[PDB]
Each structure stands twice: as C-alpha cells, then as structure tokens.
Structure 1
C-alpha cells in the first residue's frame, strides 16, 4: 500500500540515518550553544489531516523558534556531505516557557495530501485519513523493532485546537 511504503521509506531513508546521532547533537547544543536544556528525542508531528505547514509559529504562536541544532553531515547516495538540519522550539503556556524540544512534521504525510489533490495519482481524498493512520501505525510498528531509533523520537499523531498543548502533553511524560 501507499502509506506502508511511505513509512518504511521515512524510516530507512531518514530516521535510521539521523536518530542514532541525535542524542550527541542535543548534548553538544546543551553544553556549548545553549534557559533550561533542550529535551532529548525528535518530536515528530503527525497531523492525520496531512496538513504540513512550513512555519510552526504560524500553526501555533505558542511554538516559537529558538535555534537550529548543530548540523549532521554524511555521504549519502552520491551526495557528499548530505546535510541533516533540525530545529529547536520553545513551547509556551500562559506566557511562560513550558518546554524546549527538536520538532518537525513527517513530510511524507504531505505526499498523501498532494496525491489526494492530483488526478494522475489515482488517490482519493476519501482514502486519505485511513492512509495517514496507516502511515503512523506502520512507523510505530517499525520503531518497536529499532530501539536505537524508538528511544530517540516521539510520535505526535493528532486530529483537529492547541498544537503546543499536544506537544507538551507528550513532553511531560519524560
């Protein structure tokens, strides 16, 4: 299926390559570039409506860009020093900073959105929500077999609303 392949590719082609190196990048930030410490783990936003905006402070003013984590580079598929950039956000609650974390959307969910827009994709809008849930479920299943990746990320699946409160609820468990 479409979402089954997308989740396997998101893991093989991305998470598997950044998650084993993430702890060291956060530790390095907290020691030399950082206010309280940035939390560990990549917080992955999984909007089931497949709406992936480019700016997070636009989705919620209580999510404020703080800094970029130091870049990871690696030779990848003929791309010498392929760069992996990730962003740190402050999470506000009633004007106070309530958490700090590395946050981003799972970009393959935007593929489901675009395929439901384009006739040639042969993918209906009526099948999109089921595919979004299957993408999240497959990703959860893969991570359950990859400890080095599972402990370095948190999956934030939601249907619409306060995005910062959704992230904070997950953050307040570690």
Structure 2
C-alpha cells in the first residue's frame, strides 16, 4: 500500500473546500455582523483560522474539553452545506478574542491511517506526512493570493488539548499578529 497521501490531501483540501469557501467568507462575516449589529456584536477579524496540530489529533467536541475555547455561533452558509464556526477565546478567565476558527479535517485521515493497525505507517510516518501536507497547502495558498488574504494556518507541535500548552494563547498570538498587519 502506498501511503504517500499528503499531496492528495493538500490539493483535495484546497480544490474541494478552501477554493470554494474563502472567496465568500468576508461577505458572510460582514452579513452576520449586520444581522446582529445592535445585539451580538461584531467580528472584526475576517479571516478563516485553520488549526493544524502536527500530531494530527483533531477533536470533534467543539472544544468543550478546553474551557478557554468556546463555540459561540454558527457562521451560516452562502444539498451539500458549507457552514463555519465562530469561537470565543478566553485568557486568565476573561474573554480575550473572537474569530472564525476550525481544524484541518484531513489531518484526521492521517491519524486514522497511523491508528488503523496496518503495517508500514507509523507515528513517525504520520508526522512526515502532516508536515508535507502542511507545506504543500502553504505553497498552494502562496500562489492563490486572494485565498491567503482570507485564510491563516495555525501550525503547532503540542497536543491541542491537555498538558500545559495553551491553544487559546497560541490563537490569540496569531490574532494580534493579524491585527498588526491591518
């Protein structure tokens, strides 16, 4: 079995998803702000933030396990449906940020492959595939400049949940980086 999947994962994720949703994301965020203007407040950061745990451990629990990352509200679409997610970030127990946030789902493909009990695909093979996946997507996004102005990758080595690594602080650092550039 050939386990060189990273190129397929990167082009699939770009062609089948990021290429399709990134052009209209800003307008959907702006619409949401306007719909909820006097009530729910405004999301100022208009980029999709894509979490990329190199260990490929991607949770499906909407981060309820991490009390400093909380699901706020769906970002509605615009019968296969493409919606996104607004999350609140907390710091020292207090609200600290709000952004459109999600995980790179194809990392879960890499995880299952290393966890499925087949022979030639270890945790070590997985990490090299995750890195190649990451690098290929970045190279792709680096030639689709309308997409990379709408999208930021948050790449990190630690477990997304558990231990002393704070994913919330990591995201917040990226939000402040982006705030600086605009």
TM-score, structure 2 normalization? 0.85
Corresponding residue for residue 7 of structure 2: 4
Q: 1:65 aligns with which of 60, 64, 71?
A: 71
Q: 1:53 aligns with which of 48, 59, 65?
A: 59
- Cα deviation for residue 95 of structure 1 reads 2.3
Distance in structure 1 (CA, Å) of the matches to 2:155 and 2:119 = 25
Distance in structure 2 (CA, Å) of the matches to 1:24 and 1:126 = 41
User: Higher strand proportion, which one?
Assistant: 1
After TM superposition, the runs of 4+ consecutive aligned structure 1 residues lying more than 6 A away are: none
Corresponding residue for residue 169 of structure 1: 173
Write the deviation string for residues 14-50 of structure 1: whole angstroms up to 9, x where unpaired: 1000000100000001111334425211110000010
Write the deviation string for residues 63-95 of structure 1: whole angstroms up to 9, x where unpaired: 1111101223xxxxxxxx421011100111112
Corresponding residue for residue 122 of structure 2: 124
Classify the secondary structure of the residue corresponding to 1:20: coil
Q: 1:59 to 1:146 in 2, by over 3 A?
A: farther
Matches within 5 A, 1:1-174: 1-33=4-36, 34-72=40-78, 81-120=79-118, 122-160=120-158, 161-173=165-177, 174=179
Q: Which runs of 5+ in 1 are unaligned?
A: 73-80
Q: Please, what is the CA RMSD of the aligned residues?
A: 1.5
Write the deviation string for residues 97-126 of structure 1: whole angstroms up to 9, x where unpaired: 211111110010000000111244842222
Distance in structure 2 (CA, Å) of the matches to 1:85 and 1:7 = 20
How many residues in Structure 1 have an aligned counterpart in Structure 2?
A: 166
TM-score, structure 1 normalization? 0.89
Q: Which runs of 5+ in 2 are unaligned?
A: 159-164
